[PDB]
Enzyme design. Structure first.
Site, PDB file in Angstrom:
ATOM      1  CG  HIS A 192      26.214  47.380 -30.672  1.00 31.34           C
ATOM      2  ND1 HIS A 192      26.652  46.294 -29.883  1.00 31.34           N
ATOM      3  CD2 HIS A 192      25.164  46.917 -31.404  1.00 31.34           C
ATOM      4  CE1 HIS A 192      25.873  45.245 -30.117  1.00 31.34           C
ATOM      5  NE2 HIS A 192      24.924  45.603 -31.048  1.00 31.34           N
TER       6      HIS A 192
ATOM      7  CD  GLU B  78      29.346  46.761 -27.955  1.00 30.08           C
ATOM      8  OE1 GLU B  78      29.094  45.938 -28.870  1.00 30.08           O
ATOM      9  OE2 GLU B  78      28.696  47.818 -27.782  1.00 30.08           O
TER      10      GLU B  78
ATOM     11  CB  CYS C 238      22.555  43.732 -28.780  1.00 27.11           C
ATOM     12  SG  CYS C 238      23.587  42.501 -29.640  1.00 27.11           S
TER      13      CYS C 238
END
Ligand SMILES: CC(=O)NCCc1c[nH]c2ccc(F)cc12
Ligand SMILES: CC(=O)NCCc1c[nH]c2ccc(F)cc12
EC number: 3.6.1.15
Lengths: 172, 172
Positions: free
Chosen positions: B29, B53, B138
């Protein structure tokens, strides 16, 4: 950790020290250059030196860091407190290492007899190394924690075990 | 040596990690959706392998020839204590200990995320202090030391509001 706390962490002797106020500087005794007669332009005469084992406090007769506000220095912290050790590494990297604090302890680490507040790193399992743990050049780095709206300093880095898991904070 | 930390690189809306001179891993993402090149290499030249992911990039020339190749594995045994190697735009490095659990599909805020569950070991809360993850983290890698060998086993995908539970996306 706030920018004002990193600004107080000053390169000193073989490690670091920490400005508590414009006139008060704390460090680990073994990093102080043994022949030294002047600190920040001031003679020994003009400085009140308070030494308790591996803890040393310097009180200056003049304001060496007038950019700073005085903050709280405590004699260690409650067992169970999570502290950050404010470590500076190669080229403006800032490493606030997480530590869970425990009891007042006397240990033998390599040669030396060490006395202070023990704690355990919360960085990783087998933290023996510069990536997740402490190195000898880190001695004098402050132990800090946030307590409501305030930050507190409660000691300076004195030692670590061969495994790296256990560290010792020198306390006033 | 290059430190582990020199492998962690700002990328898209988060971070990624150089496993070798030619291999880069990140969280799906955070990758830009409009791009003709990454790291100055035309997307023409880049192999992209996505599994939920987790994304791996394999380049056709050596982007980081200073590095050796590291062990990449598909997650780690339950109970392993990993470190998540968080970099912040302050210049702070935050290695945080995480106890890894089961592979699962987990409800994290709004969202179903698949990967290896973990729990941060910095306890009480990360609220005020450098003790937890934030959305911008992230893609940070999960690593651990096994004998003399560093292992990378996935990338930071998600965390609860609470901050206790994290998800490590893994290779499929
Ligand atoms: C991190 C850090 O130390 N920053 C300030 C550097 C500095 C400038 N002028 C000084 C005078 C005395 C002193 F101790 C430090 C300084
Ligand atoms: C290799 C390995 O198994 N490590 C220990 C797992 C572990 C980490 N933190 C804990 C807290 C409580 C508990 F019961 C276990 C753990």
């Amino acid at each position: 950790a706030p920018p004002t706390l990193w600004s107080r962490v000053t390169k000193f002797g073989s490690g670091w020290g920490f400005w508590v106020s414009p006139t008060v500087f704390i460090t680990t005794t073994h990093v102080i250059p043994t022949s030294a007669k002047e600190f920040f332009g001031e003679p020994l005469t003009s400085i009140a030196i308070h030494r308790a084992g591996e803890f040393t406090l310097f009180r200056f007769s003049k304001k060496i860091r007038p950019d700073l506000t005085g903050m709280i220095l405590e004699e260690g912290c409650p067992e169970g407190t999570v502290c950050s050790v404010l470590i500076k590494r190669d080229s403006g990297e800032l490493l606030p290492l997480a530590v869970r604090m425990g009891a007042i302890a006397s240990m033998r680490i390599q040669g030396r007899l060490v006395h202070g507040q023990s704690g355990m790193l919360l960085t990783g399992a087998n933290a023996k190394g510069m990536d997740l743990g402490t190195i000898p050049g880190d001695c004098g780095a402050p132990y800090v924690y946030k307590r409501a709206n305030d930050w507190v300093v409660c000691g300076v880095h004195a030692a670590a075990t061969k495994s790296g898991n256990t560290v010792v904070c020198a306390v006033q």
